[PDB]
Ligand binder design. Structure first.
Ligand SMILES: O=C(c1ccccc1)N1C[C@@H](CO)[C@@H]2Oc3ccccc3[C@@H]21
Ligand SMILES: O=C(c1ccccc1)N1C[C@@H](CO)[C@@H]2Oc3ccccc3[C@@H]21
Ligand SMILES: [Zn+2]
Ligand SMILES: [Zn+2]
Ligand SMILES: [Zn+2]
Ligand SMILES: [Zn+2]
Lengths: 360, 360
């Protein structure tokens, strides 16, 4: 069976399980079951399933070099699918809640969930709660007797938390830290002193890299009972590096990719986000350019946004991007080499992860 | 040591733990640590701590009849405190997110978290996420080697899920079930055919009773390694009964308790909630009264809300309330008797739970 069809089949299985359980144990009625079914589909399906498929790919790599009964190979692949769906549902949770938090309009060329007419924010916030709760229901049901259950729940839990911490770093990235205070409405920074490499890296590491790259890789290891074929500190380092790169690309596309291709109208400039463009721009700008940036960034006014875009184009950031990319290729290659020592298989899965990120 | 001072001390301990861990492992800075500290205090403190103190009270009951080393008694009490805080933090999560969902203005005579000037909905939604994530951090840290860890995590997880399902039942309680559809903006019911005893009971059982009464009771059992002194089906039945009563009282107060005493301006009538008042009213009204109710319920207009209030006063619901109360006293007493068979101690803790609910 091809991996994707296995993964998609398991979605139908897991869906059926969750909805049958709501009927048998939670007293649900058919219409509310249907609402949840549609919610699940709308929020969890239609992306590339990169995250969930990474769990499957890591597990397949181990299967090719480890002796097992056929039924064991099936059980491991089933588990890697369930585990992959746990990640996809965790993402779904964060995309639902993030879109409400940010007042986002679209996602993947469709309206954000909360904007569907029969949803509304009042329901959507809870719908996103349910999404994450379903990850735990999946784990407890499918992995009840598994030796990796403890480690998988503990890992999931740390990654979820890291992600919410990351979200906090992100939403607060345009405030001055010394001014944070629940009692006082928060001004946007005027100095941009916090738009640094170190601060950017912190936002991205927590907000994205733990759930997008560390969790799929380590989950594949856990369902394969392979966590001793790796040095975990290498896995962490390479995850943090590739994830950073992913976000840098996402940031560039927010400003420069046509909305029909992006699946949304990018607003990082108006939202005053700590983007790779803004930090790299401020890293090379002269006094006049810095001043022009301050006068126009973080404003909904299209005139001011076009001024920021012009400032980015004029500042030749494509060159800094090529240079960053070179350095990431170097470091990722180095880490892949170091991972070959203990597991050539795992190293190859990481190479694939990197190719899929680097090319897209 | 008196139970409350132990419980409050453990809050400071747990706080310190969480915030020290953010600094040592999550790269947090002092100002964001302070924001989180203030968030935690604001959202988790200042209620009666009924839920968390129930875990402590159940555990103390067992201590009085079970032989243990002093250090064991301390360890059990510490665990019951941590477990109680897990529940208080879970509530905090749900109150933060519910207040945003409902556009609530106050809670306990203070502004809802999301309305603090330096919070905003964008941060508050994530703050409520963090709140729940902290329950898991607490459990994994404090209960890492405990024999009850699995059962406690699995129970917590089921109660959280039940609660979010309950939230869905609640927010959708004024729609006609056959009309639920993410694609279509939802009209309020015109027939009120779903304002029934069975439907009300379902909302309350899931939205409130699992986290307010079942979880504190069973958590006390788990931290005491006492789950075999009880018949779990009795524990469930008595929790569901007392919790229902709690909600019925809450519903009456929403309409009839002065706002300064309530800690908020009640809006169940304007929000078209499936309240005990509306279901009991529709259970005894004549055709004219039903029609007047339909013409005025679920509208912000104060004139229409006063008409609904007048309809409730005129319909002598205090009498139905006294009758309900009598029947609950009966049934709770019966269940307490049945629980004395296996554990007089546990039965007494349940009696206390009931006294504190029944009197308040
Ligand atoms: O893109 C690069 C880069 C790095 C190494 C070699 C060549 C280019 N940099 C360095 C800083 C320039 O302002 C920016 O901080 C960053 C933090 C994380 C990821 C990326 C960047 C940005
Ligand atoms: O309050 C009572 C009651 C019950 C038993 C004896 C005396 C009074 N009832 C019965 C139904 C009247 O419309 C209401 O459905 C309910 C569902 C749950 C809790 C409470 C009620 C309400
Ligand atoms: Zn966001
Ligand atoms: Zn982006
Ligand atoms: Zn609510
Ligand atoms: Zn209420």
């Amino acid at each position: 069976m091809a991996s994707m069809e296995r993964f998609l089949s398991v979605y139908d299985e897991v869906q059926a399980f969750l909805l049958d359980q709501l009927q048998s144990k939670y007293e649900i009625d058919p219409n509310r079951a249907r609402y949840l079914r549609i919610m699940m589909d709308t929020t969890c399906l239609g992306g590339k399933y990169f995250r969930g498929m990474t769990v499957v790919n890591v597990a397949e790599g181990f299967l090719a070099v480890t002796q097992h009964d056929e039924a064991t190979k099936e059980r491991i692949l089933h588990d890697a699918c369930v585990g992959g769906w746990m990640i996809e549902f965790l993402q779904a949770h964060y995309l639902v809640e993030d879109d409400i938090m940010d007042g986002s309009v679209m996602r993947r060329g469709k309206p954000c969930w909360y904007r569907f007419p029969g949803v509304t924010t009042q329901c959507a916030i809870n719908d996103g709660i349910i999404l994450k709760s379903w990850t735990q229901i999946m784990a407890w049901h499918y992995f009840a007797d598994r030796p990796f259950l403890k480690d998988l729940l503990c890992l999931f839990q740390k990654v979820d938390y890291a992600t919410a911490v990351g979200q906090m770093y992100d939403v607060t990235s345009m405030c001055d830290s010394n001014k944070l205070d629940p009692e006082v409405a928060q001004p946007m920074t005027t100095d941009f002193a916090e738009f640094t490499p170190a601060i950017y890296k912190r936002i991205v590491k927590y907000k994205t890299t733990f759930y997008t790259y560390l969790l799929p890789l380590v989950m594949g290891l856990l369902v394969s009972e392979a966590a001793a074929s790796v040095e975990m500190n290498l896995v962490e380092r390479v995850a943090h590096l590739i994830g950073e790169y992913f976000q840098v690309q996402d940031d560039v596309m927010d400003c420069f990719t046509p909305p029909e291709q992006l699946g949304k109208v990018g607003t990082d400039i108006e939202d005053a986000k700590c983007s790779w463009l803004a930090v790299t721009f401020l890293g090379k700008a002269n006094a006049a350019q810095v001043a022009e940036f301050k006068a126009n960034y973080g404003e909904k006014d299209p005139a001011k946004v076009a001024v920021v875009k012009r400032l980015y184009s004029k500042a030749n950031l494509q060159a800094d991007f090529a240079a960053y990319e070179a350095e990431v290729v170097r470091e990722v290659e180095s880490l892949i080499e170091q991972l070959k020592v203990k597991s050539p298989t795992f190293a190859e899965s990481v190479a694939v992860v990197w190719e899929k990120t680097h090319k897209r």
